[PDB]
């Protein structure tokens with residue numbers, strides 16, 4: 113039987129519709145996105161900064177392009193500039209400044225196709241951004257999602273600014289993570305396909321170059337939902353939020369079946385993020401639409417924004 117641990121969870125903040133994309137910037141500030149905020153039945157998603165002391169929220173950005181509101185769902189902090197890359201289910205990929213100003217990255221990919229709505233993104237150490245796109249075409253196109261049909265795609269936004277679709281035909285690709293070698297070279301891309309209860313992997317051969325698609329891991333449960341967000345700890349164990357299972361699964365470097373499970377005091381864990389240089393993990397969940405934190409067994413794997421461009425070692 114898979115061992116299960118029940119760490120102490122401390123509530124940080126609440127009342128954040130669809131609480132997602134937890135992220136820390138280069139200054140140590142904490143942000144979260146609220147993709148499910150609606151005004152008059154239309155999308156009006158928000159990007160928020162949270163004060164870790166009081167738990168008070170501040171809306172820094174409410175993305176909108178030509179009257180079309182966004183559904184921000186995933187975040188990554190850049191390294192060479194303190195700015196956030198945000199995956200939006202309606203607007204695609206956005207780059208957001210801490211002052212609240214934002215820019216739409218692309219309306220079409222490298223092959224001239226309309227961009228699809230995105231949900232999550234992950235930087236590899238070379239600066240390439242891997243993105244999951246479970247939604248259909250971005251606004252003004254009618255909103256649709258690949259929960260039932262297989263039209264979700266995977267993109268790679270390269271360092272030289274190219275938006276390349278690297279694969280498609282996924283039934284709601286969601287969480288994504290990059291496994292790196294000890295020397296820092298990116299070598300494995302892990303992608304969650306939510307409803308199918310599978311984690312897929314690819315070997316990374318270079319920027320926007322992936323091959324050897326394989327079923328990497330299996331998510332437990334027959335409940336509606338599945339793997340949502342994920343991140344690696346310093347030993348390369350992959351922690352995966354299993355939405356609807358009340359647990360966060362822990363996979364070893366080689367995948368397969370979970371080697372441990374973390375029971376949460378809520379049914380819908382969605383995403384998570386480690387606070388830099390600590391064992392503290394912040395988790396967002398959709399039962400109470402809140403953010404919690406708990407202590408893991410070790411520090412998290414450094415995010416791209418924590419690495420040095422001009423380092424020696």
Ligand SMILES: [Ca+2]
Nearest residue numbers: 232286340341
């Ligand atoms: Ca997600």
Ligand SMILES: [Ca+2]
Nearest residue numbers: 342343384385
């Ligand atoms: Ca994360």
